[PDB]
Amino acid sequence: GAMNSSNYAELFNNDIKLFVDDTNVYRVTVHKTFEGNVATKAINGCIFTLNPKTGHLFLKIIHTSVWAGQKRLSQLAKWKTAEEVSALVRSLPKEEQPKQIIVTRKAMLDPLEVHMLDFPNIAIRPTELRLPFSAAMSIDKLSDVVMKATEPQMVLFNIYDDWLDRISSYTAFSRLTLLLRALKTNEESAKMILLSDPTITIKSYHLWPSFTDEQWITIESQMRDLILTEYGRKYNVNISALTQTEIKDIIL
Amino acid sequence: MNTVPFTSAPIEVTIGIDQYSFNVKENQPFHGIKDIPIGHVHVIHFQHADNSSMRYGYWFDCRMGNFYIQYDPKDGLYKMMEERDGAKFENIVHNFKERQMMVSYPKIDEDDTWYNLTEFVQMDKIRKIVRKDENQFSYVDSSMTTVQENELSDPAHSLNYTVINFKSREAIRPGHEMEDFLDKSYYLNTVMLQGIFKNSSNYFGELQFAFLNAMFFGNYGSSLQWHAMIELICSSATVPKHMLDKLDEILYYQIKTLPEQYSDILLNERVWNICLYSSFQKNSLHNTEKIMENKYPELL
Ligand SMILES: COC(=O)CSc1nnc(N)s1
Ligand SMILES: COC(=O)CSc1nnc(N)s1
Q: Span of the secretion signal (chain B)?
């Protein structure tokens, strides 16, 4: 059924599975019209389809032309997401197709189930995890390819860079979700943390900087402090008072 | 007017005939029901006084044969049987009528309730939902499962209602996923009406039969089927105007007849709120919406 903290290790087992996040599919800026009404202008979006074990990210770029002359766009966006995930599954060799697709928002369940009727053995599941994948567009190279797109396009990434050479998928996923949660809570400060040191660079073929193991521990500590710091700024809490156990519950 | 004689009433039992009911005491000199209106299906149903488990009964049409009831002490129920000897049957009925051992089907002349509940219900269609071809009448009880319930376990004792499933390849044209899921008109008009039922009369007959089994036997799968058939119409943007007006009449009399005290178990809140207030047909069921709001405002 639903995916939560009780069955968290199932994400890193050998059954091919994908997360689908539709947050960034339909993106708009809201603005005033000359007559003083309000209007939206769509901007390019993306479907964030991620393998938690391998890091493979299937980034389907949603070009604003797909909305032209359509109504009820927030509803359509869910069905367009489902259509594109179904098309991706059909494009994969059978031995690469997922056994489960986990949607980050429960409103995707019916659209995806209906589009996947031809795949009755692929389980479509919600999750009780609050995952920060909406912050994907805070990763500069992902944002860049989405905005520059002039047509629909699928771009493939490994969102873990080369981390799996050194760490498990469980640890890589924990490092990813902490980075994304920090970027979601305070983008400016998170990016400051990630690039403050000009001697650490992002390889051309990577998304994140080339940190050593020790630098990653420092970075991850700084990200947990940021999320803690913001948590305090939000609720007006003296974080200095907080014990280590108290900090553990808040970070996720 | 036709007659269903009883051989005897050896066990205390509440007996229903259509929407009427009466209590018979253990070994009371009861020998059947007379003055049954010709021209409609009927249902004669039972709930034992010492074991209200298993409401059960028989759908029949007196035009199709001479039927009577006899208690079976081995199987522990009142069974319907057909008498093939016409003069034996006439002679049995005449004797029981002369001794006034029969209850009279108690139809008020002004009262169209039973017609309005069975307008589209035909025996021949019942016998395809309830498969027991050696009898002209059809047994139904509280516990019988539907073909769909069994897919989700004795197939001979099943209610073979037409399977309706909104998330199925039958309901959803490849390439029309969003369209067909949000507007079920394809599924209603092409798959179900043109394809399976052939016309709206057969669809309404099955709908009415499902409601009656739900109401009279507390048959849960029948209730599921009744609601699915309502929801399939209400969730279609394109429905013939004559079907919508007829549906409003059908549901009105169903809601009117439902025991006030069974609404919690016989009415699905989600379906009714969706059908009356959110669906394409939210404004097409005036009579039904008005009786539902005055009789079951809590459900809504
Ligand atoms: C590198 O490829 C594999 O390890 C295939 S097994 C598997 N892949 N993805 C999952 N979620 S389980
Ligand atoms: C905040 O959520 C987490 O999962 C943080 S734990 C962690 N991040 N990075 C590591 N190498 S272990």
A: none
- B259 SS3 class: coil
Query: Which of chain A's residues have a Cβ under 8 Å away from the Cβ of B167?
Result: 110, 113-114, 117
Residue closest via CA to ligand 2's atom 8 equals A175
Alpha helix ranges (H) inside chain B: 86-98, 113-118, 123-129, 147-151, 177-182, 185, 200-217, 220-234, 241-257, 263-266, 269-273, 286-295
- Quickly tell me which residue has 């919690």 as its tokens: B264
Nearest C-alpha neighbor of A193 from the set A204, A171, A209, A174: A209
Answer whether A55's CB lies under 8 Å from A159's CB: yes
A226 touches B: beta carbon within 8 Å: no
d(CA B225, CA B234) in angstroms, rounded, equals 14
User: Measured in Å, how far apart are chain A's first and last C-alpha atoms?
Assistant: 22
The CATH superfamily label for domain A165-251 reads: Prp8 RNase H domain, fingers region (1.20.80.40)
Q: Within 10 A of A239 (CB to CB), how many other CB atoms are there?
A: 16
A10 residue type, one letter: E
Query: CA B250 to CA B257: how far, in whole Å?
Result: 11
Whose tokens are 């897919």? That residue is: B151
CB B245 within 8 A of CB B260: no
Residue of A nearest to B170 (CA): A117
Question: Ligand 1 centroid to A171 CA: how many Å?
Answer: 16
Nearest atom (ligand 1) to Cα of A14? 12
> How is chain A split into domains, by residue range?
8-164, 165-251
User: What does this entry list as its resolution, in Å?
Assistant: 1.5
Residues of A in contact with B177 (CB under 8 A): 79, 82-83, 111, 114-115
Tokens of B122: 């035909």
Cβ proximity of B171 and A116 under 8 Å: no
- Cβ neighbours of A113 in B, within 8 Å: 167
SS3 at position A154: strand
Q: Where are the domains of chain B?
A: 1-143, 144-300
| Structure determination method | X-ray
The yes-or-no answer to whether A8-164 and A165-251 have a common fold is: no
What's the rounded Cα separation, in Å, for the pair A63 and A153?
8
Cα dihedral A158, A163, A166, A170 sign = negative
* DSSP H or E stretch at residue B16: strand B13-17
Residue of A102, A92, A99 whose CA lies nearest to A127:
A102
For B19, the token pair is 């929407």
User: Domain A8-164 is of which CATH architecture?
Assistant: 2-Layer Sandwich (3.30)
Bridge partners of B60? B42
- Atom of ligand 2 minimally distant from the CA of A216: 11
Whether B169 and chain A come into contact, CB under 8 Å, resolves to: yes
